Amino acid sequence: PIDGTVISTPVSEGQTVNSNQTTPTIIKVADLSKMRIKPEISEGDITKVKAGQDVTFTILSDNKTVYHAKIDSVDPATTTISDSAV
């Protein structure tokens, strides 16, 4: 369906499949020219967190890279609805 690049491949060339009942995923292809990070953002901060907000972040593999991005928009539903401790 897309080009982005290849990210999984659960299949075996030589392998029987059974798609009548549930749909066998075969290759997983998503877009790696952009990416998108999903900030978990707890139930008491959200009254405050708004869309387009001078964010910053850092890779758990960087001693200072410090990324200068921006919040882009809001979900209306928890991280368990969208796509206890909440």
Partner 1 sequence: VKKGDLLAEIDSTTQINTLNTRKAALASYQAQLVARKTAYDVALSNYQRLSKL
Partner 2 sequence: YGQKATSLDTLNTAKATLNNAKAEMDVVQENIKQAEIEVNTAETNLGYTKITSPIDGTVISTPVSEGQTVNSNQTTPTIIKVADLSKMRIKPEISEGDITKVKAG
Which range touches partner 2 (CB under 8 A), out of 39-47, 48-56, 66-74, 75-83?
A: 75-83
Residue pair 36/42 in contact by the 8 Å Cβ criterion: no
- The tally of CA atoms less than 13 A away on the side-chain side of residue 48 is 5
Q: How far is CA 64 from CA 34, 57, 59, 60, in A?
A: 21, 10, 9, 10
Residue pair 56/68 in contact by the 8 Å Cβ criterion: yes
Q: Which does 21 bind (CB under 5 to 8 A by kind): partner 2, partner 1, none?
A: partner 2
Which range touches partner 1 (CB under 8 A), out of 22-30, 37-45, 57-65, 72-80?
A: 22-30
By beta-carbon proximity to partner 1, the closer residue of 6 and 69 is 6
Give the footprint of partner 2 on this chain (CB under 8 A): 1-2, 14, 16-23, 59-62, 76-77, 81-83
